[PDB]
Amino acid sequence: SVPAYLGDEDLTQETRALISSLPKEKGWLVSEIYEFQGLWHTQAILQGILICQKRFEAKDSDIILVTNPKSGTTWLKALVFALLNRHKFPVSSSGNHPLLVTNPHLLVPFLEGVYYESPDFDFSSLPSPRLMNTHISHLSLPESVKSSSCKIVYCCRNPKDMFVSLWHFGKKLYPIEKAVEAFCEGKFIGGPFWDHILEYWYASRENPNKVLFVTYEELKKQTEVEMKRIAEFLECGFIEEEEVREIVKLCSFEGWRDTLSESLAEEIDRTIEEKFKGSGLKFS
Secondary structure (H helix, E strand, C coil), rough: CCCCCCHHHHHHHHHHHHHHHHEEEECCCCEEEEEEECEEEEEHHHHEEEEHHHHHHCCCCCCEEEEEEEEEHHHHHHHHHHHHHCCCCHHHHHHHHHHHHHCCCHHHHHHHHHHHCCCCCCCCCCCCCCCEEEECCCHHHHHHHHCCCCEEEEECCCCCHHHHHHHHHHHCCCHHHHHHHHHCCCCCCCCCCHHHHHHHHHHHHCCCCEEEEEEHHHHCCHHHHHHHHHHHHHHCCCHHHHHHHHHHHHCCCCCHHHHCCHHHHHHHHHHHHHCCCCCCCCCC
């Protein structure tokens, strides 16, 4: 087997030998996954990472949201966009708010996705401060991102939700028991899951002005508190509790427990405990 021919021919020729040389495994969501810098990727995402690493030029004023593959990000993208833009596009003029005019996925673009499909897209023609989204590993971010003083928010979902998102996506398009086993081994799309998470967890403790670690579970349960925490990481000034409440209210128009049998949930929990000892990130 050889890789597919996807996208811009010129970029295909620039990346195809590299991709053809990497380790590959049977894909579930896809024909083959490929190991690149420690993580397994679909061909499309890998082409977009390779181009992104070569072409993206970070700015110190950038904010990058890092999320896991196939989780919903509409709500998070909206909250952070609305917070950052709360004077440029006041939360109150509601009907005229970009979140209402346009889709949050166009406002807060998925980097690797854009590079896959539109390799010449000029990110510098977007307004600063640029809010953007990625799933790229902390260790695989473009060198300009690593060297900048931009801000990175890692939004961590429970690994069981990370799996179920991938599962629900693929089954939409090989039994669940086998997919759980592969996910737990790490040889699975976007995996190993523990490395994706731990690299940002470590960065959030070692370089807390560069990386902030947010659990989706806390963003859901205590949204006002978590948003004030994000604001304080992103910006220097004071933010009123009411400004945060109005942001949450604007964004209010935008789990594994129902899908996983208990034996699969426990299987993932066994890998979580093993891999996260004593990190100490613990999950609820």
